[PDB]
Amino acid sequence: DTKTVQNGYFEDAAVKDRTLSDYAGNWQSVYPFLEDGTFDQVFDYKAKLTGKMTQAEYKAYYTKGYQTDVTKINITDNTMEFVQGGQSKKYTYKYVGKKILTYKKGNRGVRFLFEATDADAGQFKYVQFSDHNIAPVKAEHFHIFFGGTSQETLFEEMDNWPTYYPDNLSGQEIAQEMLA
Template structure:
C-alpha cells in the first residue's frame, strides 16, 4: 500500500470511518468476483447498481497499455489460492469455482496491447492488429438483477483476421483508466452481447503472477 493523498485538517478528528466493499457481483452471470489494487469508485456502480443518467461514453484511451491474460495462471495452478479464498466465504466448492472460472477466463489470446486507436491481439506471440473507433455502449441486465455496461469499438482498418468488434467491460460506466478488464470480440455485435459465461480477463503485463494473485485476494 502507498499514500495516495494527504489532507490537512484543523485539530484532531474525533472519529474515523473506513468504507470498503466486498462480495462484488460480477458483470457476467451474477457470481462473486474478486478484484483489488485500484479504485473502483462508487461501490454501488461497481456492483452493477446505477441509473442510466450516470453512464457516459468512454474513449479507447481508458484501456491503453499492455495487458496479459490471466488464463495461463489458472491453467498452471497459480490461481488456486483464489478458489480457496472464494470457497471459504462463498456457496461453492473450490472445484466448482475453478470450473466456473476455467470457462470464464478461457482464451487463446495471451496478450492485448492498446496504443491510440490500434489494438493488437497476440496468439503464440504473433499479433493481429486493427484500428478501432467508438461504436457506443450497451447496458445489460443480468439474471441476478445487477447491470453492466459494454463499451464497444468497431474496426475501421487493419488485418482481415482482426475482429470487427471489441467490447470492454471493467465494471465502470464513465471515463476512468481501467485497472483490468474483461474483453469480448468477434464479428457479430449483437451476438457478443449475449455472451455472459466467457469473459477473457486482462491485467497489466507489468504485474507478475504473485502480484495478480494478491490483487485478487485483497477483496
C-alpha cells in the same frame, strides 16, 4: 452483494461514454495463472468468503470464463494488437457506444464498444470491454468480447470473458488484486 457500482448496481444516468485511451497499455491474459495453480488460493478464499461455490466449483467457473488463446493485447489510444497462436494482428479502432446488460441476478453491467476501421479485421472487427465501471476512468483490468459479425452478437456471450491485467504484474500480484 452490497449495492455498489462495481457490483453492478448503478443509475442509468451515470453511464457515460468512454474512449479507447481508458484501456491503453500492455496487457496479459490471466488464464496461464489459473492453469498453473496460482489462482487456487483465490478460489479457496472466495469459497470460504461467499459460500456460493466450493473451490472446485469456482475453478470450473473461472476456467470457462478465462480460457483464451489471445495471450497478450496491446492497446493505444487508437489501436489494438492481439497476440494469438503464433500471430499478431493489429487494427485501428473507433468508439461506437455502450450497452447496459441486465444479468439474471438483477444487477447489471456496461460494455464499451469499438469497431475496427480496417477492412480485414476478421474476428477482431467488433470488440467490447467490461471492467465493472460505467464511465471514464483508467482501466485496471478488463474482460473482453470480440467477433466478426456485430456488437449485438457479442451481447449473447455471458460465460467466456477472457481477462487481462497489466503486463508488469506477476501472476502472484494478479492473485493479490483478485483477493482484494
